[PDB]
Structure 1
Amino acid sequence: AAPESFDEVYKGRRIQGRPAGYEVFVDGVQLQVMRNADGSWISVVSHYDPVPTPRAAARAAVDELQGAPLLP
């Protein structure tokens, strides 16, 4: 049962999420994310640090990136 979609500007960058199991984009570039058995999430730029939701993983990625473009 998938999380809801989201779309917002976070620290100046557009973050979007949508069910697909779930896709996240940072300024239109896909951010790979993964769901853990307990329902938390990680992303490929925070792969050892569970956060509760795909939006939390998108925000953590924007924090980690410090303005840098994501690579596809």
Structure 2
Amino acid sequence: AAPESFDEVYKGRRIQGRPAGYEVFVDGVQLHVMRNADGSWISVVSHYDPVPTPRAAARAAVDELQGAPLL
């Protein structure tokens, strides 16, 4: 069962998530995320640091980006 979708503005940036297995977007640009066997998540901007949820991964990405747009 995939996580619920989400949509919020985090640190001035819009982050969204939705089941597909799951997609995340930072200001309309998709952020590649991956789920681990134990259910945690990682993203392309934080690939060796598991976080509990897709929203956690999205927020971590925004933190790491420091305002920079995702490619």
Q: What range is the shorter-chain TM-score in?
A: over 0.9
Cα displacement string for residues 33-60 of structure 1 (whole angstroms, at most 9, x for unaligned residues) = 0000000000000000000000000000
Q: Which runs of 5+ in 2 are unaligned?
A: none
Provide the C-alpha distance between the structure 2 equivalents of 1:53 and 1:3, rounded to a whole number of angstroms: 8
Identity over aligned residues, as a percent? 99
TM-score by length of 2: 1.00
Matches of 1:47 and 1:2, distance apart in 2: 20
Q: Which runs of 4+ in 1 moved over 3 A?
A: none
**Count of paired positions:** 71
Give deviations 1:13-51, integer Å, cap 9, x for gaps.
000000000000000000000000000000000000000
Q: Give the match's secondary structure for 1:39.
A: coil
SS in 2 for 1:63: helix
The Cα RMSD (Å) is: 0.2
Mark the runs of 5 or more structure 1 residues left unpaired by the alignment.
none
Q: TM-score, normalised by structure 1?
A: 0.98
